Design a protein around this ligand. Structure first.
Ligand SMILES: NC(=O)c1ccc[n+]([C@@H]2O[C@H](COP(=O)([O-])OP(=O)(O)OC[C@H]3O[C@@H](n4cnc5c(N)ncnc54)[C@H](O)[C@@H]3O)[C@@H](O)[C@H]2O)c1
Ligand SMILES: NC(=O)c1ccc[n+]([C@@H]2O[C@H](COP(=O)([O-])OP(=O)(O)OC[C@H]3O[C@@H](n4cnc5c(N)ncnc54)[C@H](O)[C@@H]3O)[C@@H](O)[C@H]2O)c1
Ligand SMILES: [Zn+2]
Ligand SMILES: [Zn+2]
Ligand SMILES: [Zn+2]
Ligand SMILES: [Zn+2]
Lengths: 374, 374
């Protein structure tokens, strides 16, 4: 195994929408200017990949999805100084350039050179690295980790502790940092406060873990699928409310149940109705609603601005407000100190060739996170 | 003059919408328990009164509007311990009871016993005091000051110092505290930041005064009426942009002028497309847009939630985040130290009987504030 050879490995190429991930053979180019090629170890299955295959994230197809992962650097670029081959890394959902306008600001992680505002499906030089049956396959958000080998940039890769169990640590890359960081850093949950969480996936259970870590008194988990409440109460949900039980709207349910509205509210579903709902179930004068789940594309809201004008605050968060190269090594380093229990997010551990199976476990609602070990 | 007699005095009663303020003879009942009856001195003309006569604030009419005022306590009710007859006070657009859930929160001024979320047009005993030709006339948000005498509550009145020129100090009651407080307290404008202000009335010029007072580098004033730019540059507007000059949409005008969007943005107009515009002209990762102007009633927005989801923050503010009985005496006390120059808001000083004239100066765009001295 040399450093500048093209690797024929296996990947899960998605060709067009509403079709299964075709696990096929791809050629992977060596690292060009300021790149890192990663032997991939464990890759989580996020709902954003289901947003790719369902069509609510418009990315240029054919694509290799996957952004929630950890791996080992196997070949290195020409001038990169952060990582060297052999050490465990996490591919970063949002890069940290260090030179841009956002990266020099005290708050703000959404770098200007990411791939989510205007998705090009490629790397920052303009050219892809995956070729499958002679045609190029697009990347996904600069990580594209549904393969045995991926190629990322230096600014979108994070060096983590060398003794990290990657099958669990791969959740720091997208899901847990989004939820936990959305609770403790974006919303800034104060002690004794009352929180509401809309959606109990890996992100929502991470929100409950963050609100419990910030010392919230009541944490209210709101979800249709009632089985997930049995998970939510073990990570901090003191109350659990199903919208399908109540013919009254759930705005007024969380209003009367939490004495006029919750203090902090979170929407991790990704639907517009629960965005407006999660805003309107806050307190009218000091409520903070954080949008976490991504909406379907080219679709707007219908929102009464008086809901904001009485005193609410309505934020958003990508990767939980965490500057990635700065916060991922200290979140894995804080996982070393057992600060958070990352085990209740993982429900299924499957090999890579069963990848569609994992997505069925994501689409039938029978799983929280399905880890793809390689 | 005694303390418990019904007083015939002149007022500007608005009977039904889209009609002039009929200045007629009203009777004012004496103040009941925990109420204050005020010799009114000077009453400013706000755009929210034009929102009453235009129909975008659904209140129960016939109503005596007007909330920007300063007066003298002339008779007192029982149980009132704060103010005593003879001292200058300011009626409060939003009360501060001190016992509610909002009034014990560190941030949040929107008290639960106000009259703006569910407007009843009366006081907390459910009973008005203005009778005109035998029929009762409704209050306006518990501070109905288009009359020579008025009756407010103890929770909705603020004792100011005895040496205050009320013809200028009456703008602390609604307008200036909304603008200045929206800049320095709700948005928390940091040192050297870049601000944008949509609308250059009394509230918008107060926003510019607050952003300059918090040390903003660039303050961009955006308004259709170009004459108002000649006022805005004397209170801090380093740049001034007209949307009517630019055939390109003003969102990417403010994005191109401020290199990716302004740091803080403010919408003090009170209309929906400028709210979505003022949100979208912030920075994608650390922008804060504050809604100030009240929208038309029961009309929603059409807003792309990705604008919030990249990292923006979208707030609102009634009375600029100021707890009223706590902040009005220290804002008049800070007017004593000449901390802010309140003269450039006042453009016209008219008597009360010319009140419709002042509203014409509000509706033709030829004035900033029209003070109604008695
Ligand atoms: N902002 C970010 O950076 C970021 C990062 C990761 C994921 N996400 C987004 O988070 C979203 C969900 O991710 P996930 O990990 O939580 O998986 P998930 O979709 O399985 O969890 C969402 C839950 O919402 C519930 N749901 C659907 N409709 C509902 C309704 N009316 N009321 C209540 N609940 C309802 C579902 O039961 C589901 O359990 C996705 O859209 C993903 O894109 C955002
Ligand atoms: N939140 C609060 O507590 C509070 C308090 C006082 C006033 N207000 C609201 O503030 C709003 C107006 O306040 P004001 O005192 O400045 O009155 P104003 O009418 O003098 O200011 C409005 C300005 O908006 C501008 N305008 C209209 N359309 C525009 C457009 N497309 N683009 C740019 N500018 C446009 C007008 O030129 C005007 O200068 C009102 O809705 C009023 O109710 C809110
Ligand atoms: Zn993910
Ligand atoms: Zn950056
Ligand atoms: Zn006003
Ligand atoms: Zn109160």
């Amino acid at each position: 195994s040399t450093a500048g050879k093209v690797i024929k490995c296996k990947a899960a190429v998605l060709w067009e929408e509403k079709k299964p991930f075709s696990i096929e053979e791809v050629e992977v180019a060596p690292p060009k200017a300021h790149e890192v090629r990663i032997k991939m170890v464990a890759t989580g299955i996020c709902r954003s990949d289901d947003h790719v295959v369902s069509g609510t994230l418009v990315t240029p197809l054919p694509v290799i999805a996957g952004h929630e992962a950890a791996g080992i650097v196997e070949s290195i670029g020409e001038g990169v100084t952060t990582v060297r081959p052999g050490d465990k890394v996490i591919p970063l959902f949002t890069p940290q350039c260090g030179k841009c306008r956002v990266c020099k600001h005290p708050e703000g992680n959404f770098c200007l050179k990411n791939d989510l505002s205007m998705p090009r499906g490629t790397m920052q030089d303009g050219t892809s690295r995956f070729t499958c049956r002679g045609k190029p396959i697009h990347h996904f958000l600069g990580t594209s980790t549904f393969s045995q080998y991926t190629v990322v940039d230096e600014i979108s890769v994070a060096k983590i502790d060398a003794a990290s169990p990657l099958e669990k640590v791969c959740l720091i890359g997208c899901g847990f940092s989004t939820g936990y960081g959305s609770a403790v850093k974006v919303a800034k949950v104060t002690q004794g406060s009352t929180c509401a969480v809309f959606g109990l996936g890996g992100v929502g259970l991470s929100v409950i873990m963050g609100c419990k870590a910030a010392g919230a008194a009541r944490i209210i988990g709101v979800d249709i699928n009632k089985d997930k409440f049995a998970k939510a109460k073990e990570v901090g949900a003191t109350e659990c409310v199903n919208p399908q039980d109540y013919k009254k709207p759930i705005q007024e349910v969380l209003t009367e149940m939490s004495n006029g509205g919750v203090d902090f509210s979170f929407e991790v579903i990704g639907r517009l109705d629960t965005m407006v709902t999660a805003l309107s179930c806050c307190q009218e004068a000091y409520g903070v609603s954080v949008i976490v789940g991504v909406p379907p594309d080219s679709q707007n809201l219908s929102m009464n601005p008086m809901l904001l004008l009485s005193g609410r605050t309505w934020k958003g968060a990508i990767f939980g407000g965490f500057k990635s190269k700065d916060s991922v090594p200290k979140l894995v380093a804080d996982f070393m100190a057992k600060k958070f229990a990352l085990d209740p997010l993982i429900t299924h551990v499957l090999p890579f060739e069963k990848i569609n199976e994992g997505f069925d476990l994501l689409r039938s609602g029978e799983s929280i996170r399905t880890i793809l070990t390689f």
